[PDB]
Amino acid sequence: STLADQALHNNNVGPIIRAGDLVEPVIETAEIDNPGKEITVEDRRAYVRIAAEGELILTRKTLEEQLGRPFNMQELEINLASFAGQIQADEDQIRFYFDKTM
Template sequence: MEQTHVKMVGPVIRGLDANLADAVITAIETDNPDADVMVDDQGGYIRIGVPQRCRITQASLEEALGRKFNLPELEPQLSGFAGRMKLTDDEVVWYLERQD
């Protein structure tokens, strides 16, 4: 039987600000309700992965943080990410450009 490898996309957050990291995880779970969200906490960084497409909105991140937060401020907190990243005024989406 052949197993299919599911490609994960999403952010790698620096683990220095635990409140922001927890809020990002919560917001991604909220914004991707039908997806299995994988969280790999390595102490210095936290890798968050969602199969194929991962979305986080400013509204869900602000709700999880309990304060205003501009999405462009998230980018310096990333130590990396998997997939392609598209940033707009109200959301960040990580996605696969190709399916292979």
């Protein structure tokens, strides 16, 4: 429960990307579109858990650049296996975020 309390008391948000061609482009995009947030990456081979504190944005424009081919934001669904945080998504970007601070 010390372990459990510490596990629960996080503000980590971000995409969990399944293995495939979106892993590195999303990590790169997370770094670029959240300047001055540290991005943490946990590699589980079948998926990668990418996080930041409180808010993590992915913009279509940056993702397209990092992926290296035409990309529409809805396409991320092909590779977005899960996510931490609440989600706000439109044609231009996706925001993972929390209302509260623990």
